[PDB]
Design a protein around this nucleic acid. Structure first.
Ligand SMILES: [Mg+2]
Lengths: 122, 120, 48, 215, 114
RNA sequence: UUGGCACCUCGAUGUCGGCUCAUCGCAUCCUGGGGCUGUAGUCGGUCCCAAGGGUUGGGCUGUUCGCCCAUUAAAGCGGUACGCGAGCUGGGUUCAGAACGUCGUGAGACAGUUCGGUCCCUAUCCGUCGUGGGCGUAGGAAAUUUGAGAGGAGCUGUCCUUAGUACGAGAGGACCGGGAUGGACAUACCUCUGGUGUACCAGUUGUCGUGCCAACGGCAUAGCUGGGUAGCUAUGUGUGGACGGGAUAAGUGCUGAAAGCAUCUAAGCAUGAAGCCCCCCUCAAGAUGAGAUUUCCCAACUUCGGUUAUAAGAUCCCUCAAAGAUGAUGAGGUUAAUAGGUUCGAGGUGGAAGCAUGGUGACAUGUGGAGCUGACGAAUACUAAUCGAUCGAAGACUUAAU
């Protein structure tokens, strides 16, 4: 359950280490977002170098929240930390080296470049 | 379960006091709600007394008060001893019940329903 | 917060038409013949 | 078409084919009997009156609803059936398909039917504005003395009154509620149980009416 | 009967091939994933952290450290999408629910066999 | 709106913002339907019909306003004492303190700033939201109902297909028709995920106690800590706004004269909107117009009922919860499973006490998924619903069919 002013760790090598969510896209009154939802955010901490610099306003897709998702069979998956990946407006990543486990629910949203580039899809 | 107009600790203390007093006297006068609530407590005590084993005695000591009864012939014994030595014997063949409630009219200082709760 | 007018005698006696007590739920005691509260002990005799 | 009366047992879960969690409500529908046939020429409209459960027979000096009184026994003896605790009637059914005294059986429904279930919702008693009507609450700090009150009840001297239906505190729950487009998951003829998908209004052991979806 | 109806209705979808395990054992769960192509099996190996109210509604949870990020996966006990549950090793704990493992990393979260 | 006037109010009609809760208008922000276009299509522009629903979250200011950041189908404009302080706040403003600039010889002053500065009230009436009693509804009752009327809902995005077939130097790129999924909102519910869970299980600190060891009890926020049943719950699970008819608005017409032509109009006949009526949900015969159906009860005195007391049915009183502020509602009162107890479980906790063994000891292992266990499931009259009382019909006239 990611809302605005929520801090998130970024799980790629794009350049951004942390972001804060300005808005959850998808509709008027939309308040929270889970894995597979896209947010607009401002990067708060960045690595020296990389394509994304501190202060940029960027799109990102949520991977592995700690609120977790229910599946149709009644199985739930939860994670240790909220995470996100900066996307290039074609649902494609900016980084090249996605880190950390990734939920399988991203395969539906056509984030196949993110899903294939993750060490573990669950 | 009822609250009896009393906090949790005060209600626990009051219920175990009322249980011990019914055991000592075999019949007491109290309010209807308090009797309806002490019925269960004292009856579970008699259930523990009917088992008679040491763990059950150690468990019934959790609820009874350290009260002393003077029998006849200057015989003296605790409430625990009366529970496990005379009242358990009285109800070895009975499989529940153990208490009876007789409603009496309202008392004067309030309109409270006074009742007699006895042993059976 | 405060009454705007008096309450007339008519209005007052209308409001207190349901301010009453009922007769006790009493029954003759089978053993002693005196009235008692149903489901209570007969205080004159002490039975049942 | 094809309604029935039953009582709610509780909720559970079943695994469908391909294995999906299907939350279900267990409804026990037993001794359903047609007690009357309302007809246009006699009543002005067609319906079937269905009795459900089983009262005990009339007795002298009964003190509760457990025993049928003489009016109810005579009514249920005009058809050949025992007195029933819940009596409803159904308009969506075809009266000619039914016969007085017959037994509305559980397998009139088949898995995959789409149904409407009517119950009386769970009671809540005297409840305030924010729970009874979903209203937001005032600030809990910043010197606020407005926490769970209803807001203004109107305007100023234009109006000089409170309009009807202001959403003020009162007795919540206990209303007739119909949930629409639920589907039966399976029928158990020996246990006389319909498994409906999802949840239905009312407390456990209440009364539910299942009938064919009007949509 | 008005009481067994929950159990009577739900009995047919209770599995009897599940082994016995308790909170604290590391087990491997074989789950049937149906991708777009086929029904390959995938294994979730982790420590049981809790398990819940019985019947078909029974649920258990297994925790693992995937790539430095703790992943918790909870299953219905009788879900037909579990092919097989292997108790890989037994564990000595003193709680029914092992929520305290969520704060620990590394050697802090070790459990003795048997 | 800024004003003008001085008509109500100075033996008081609290003035700005915000919060809470709305309600109405339409000169319509979106969505629905159209005409014209310098409308090729997607985009627009302007005007017409339409008030059903909808109409964002932040940064800065006391701010309304405004600018900005991100969204959105859209972020509409106004009235309701610039709606709402006996509903809330109190940042601005308008007492007493102090200070700056400035003016004054001065006391002091400024709608110039700046820091600080008591927001009272137990609801009588109408009104409103919920709940009871009385009488009526021409006998007395139990249940099932019709629906005169009334309220509620009414929003909308994106993707795929048609289809890149449709306009087309190109760039771009469908109308309609067909599917699939969301956002917000509303309802019901606790199986699942969680929250709580003060008479559930366990660990632990200090101190006092039950003589002592061991085991337990009190108190320290429930002493604290880790879990947690029922109930109650959302952030969790389902479902809903689906169709589809009738009449219309703007509009488009067909036939057709006034006016041997033309003409949607005069006569006549079509078609046409998220709007109107119905459809869907809920309430409802105090609907004094008091309705309907099925069933139950049916005498014996009268000295003429202005009649007892009883039937059918209720209640008092008592055990309770799926219900409840209290009435009420519903489950039951011995020809009985209503509550307690007892027994058996489910779930929870996680391995009792006592012994035995090992260790110097803290402890560990075994006996043994042990012991305990509010509310959930079942059985069982052991305890309490043991005696009894009260209320409750005999069916009015007239007329017509009979
Ligand atoms: Mg005055």
């Amino acid at each position: 359950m990611i809302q605005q002013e929520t801090r998130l760790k970024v799980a790629d090598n794009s350049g951004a280490r942390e972001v804060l969510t300005i808005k959850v896209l998808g509709g008027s009154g939309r308040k929270t977002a889970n894995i597979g939802d896209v947010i607009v955010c401002t990067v708060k901490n960045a690595t020296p170098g990389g394509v994304v610099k501190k202060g940029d306003v960027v799109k990102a897709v949520i991977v592995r929240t700690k609120s977790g998702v229910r599946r149709n069979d009644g199985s739930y998956i939860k994670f240790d930390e909220n995470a996100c990946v900066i996307i290039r407006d074609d649902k494609g990543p900016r980084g090249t080296r996605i880190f950390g486990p990734v939920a399988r629910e991203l395969r539906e949203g056509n984030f196949m470049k993110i899903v294939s580039l993750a060490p573990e899809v669950l | 379960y009822r609250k009896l107009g009393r906090t949790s600790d005060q209600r626990k203390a009051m219920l175990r006091d009322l249980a011990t007093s019914l055991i000592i006297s075999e019949r007491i006068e109290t309010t209807e709600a308090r009797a309806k609530e002490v019925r269960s407590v004292v009856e579970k005590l008699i259930t523990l007394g009917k088992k008679g084993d040491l763990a059950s005695r150690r468990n019934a000591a959790k609820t009874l008060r350290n009260v002393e009864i003077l029998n006849e012939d200057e015989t003296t014994q605790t409430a625990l001893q009366k529970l496990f030595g005379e009242i358990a014997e009285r109800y070895t063949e009975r499989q529940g019940g153990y208490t009876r409630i007789l409603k009496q009219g309202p008392r004067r200082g309030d309109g409270a329903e006074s009742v007699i709760i006895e042993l059976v | 917060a405060v009454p705007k007018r008096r309450t007339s005698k008519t209005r007052k006696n209308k409001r207190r038409t349901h301010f009453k007590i009922s007769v006790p739920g009493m029954t003759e005691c089978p053993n002693c013949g005196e009235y008692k509260l149903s489901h209570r002990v007969c205080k004159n005799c002490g039975s049942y | 078409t094809k309604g029935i009366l039953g009582r709610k047992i509780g909720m559970t879960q079943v695994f469908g084919e391909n294995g999906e969690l299907i939350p279900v409500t267990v409804v026990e529908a037993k001794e359903n009997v047609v007690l009357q046939k309302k007809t246009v020429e006699v009543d002005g409209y067609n319906a079937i009156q269905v009795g459900f459960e089983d009262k005990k027979a009339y007795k002298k000096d009964a003190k509760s609803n457990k025993y049928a009184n003489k009016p109810a026994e005579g009514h249920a003896k005009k058809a050949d059936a025992a007195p029933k605790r819940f009596i409803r009637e159904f308009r969506n059914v075809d009266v000619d398909a039914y016969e007085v005294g017959q037994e509305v059986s559980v397998d009139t429904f088949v898995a995959g039917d789409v149904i409407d279930v009517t119950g009386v919702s769970k009671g809540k008693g005297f409840q305030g504005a924010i729970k009874r009507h979903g209203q937001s609450r005032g600030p809990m700090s910043h010197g606020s003395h407005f926490h769970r009150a209803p807001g203004s009840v109107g305007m100023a001297s234009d109006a000089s009154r409170v309009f009807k239906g202001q959403k003020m505190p009162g007795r919540m729950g206990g209303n007739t509620v119909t949930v629409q487009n639920l589907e039966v998951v399976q029928v158990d003829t020996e246990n006389k149980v319909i498994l409906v998908k999802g949840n239905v209004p009312g407390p456990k052991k209440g009364l539910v009416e299942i009938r064919t979806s009007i949509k | 009967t008005n009481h067994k109806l929950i159990e009577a209705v739900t009995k047919s979808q209770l599995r009897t091939d599940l082994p016995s395990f308790r909170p604290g054992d590391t087990l491997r769960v074989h789950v049937r994933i149906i991708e777009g192509t086929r029904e390959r099996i995938q294994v979730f190996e982790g420590v049981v952290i809790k398990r819940r109210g019985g019947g078909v509604s029974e649920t258990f949870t297994v925790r693992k450290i995937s790539s430095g990020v703790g992943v918790e996966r909870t299953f219905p006990l009788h879900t037909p999408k579990i092919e097989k549950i292997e108790v890989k090793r037994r564990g000595k704990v003193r709680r029914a629910k092992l929520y305290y493992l969520r704060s620990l990393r590394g050697k802090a979260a070790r459990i003795q066999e048997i």
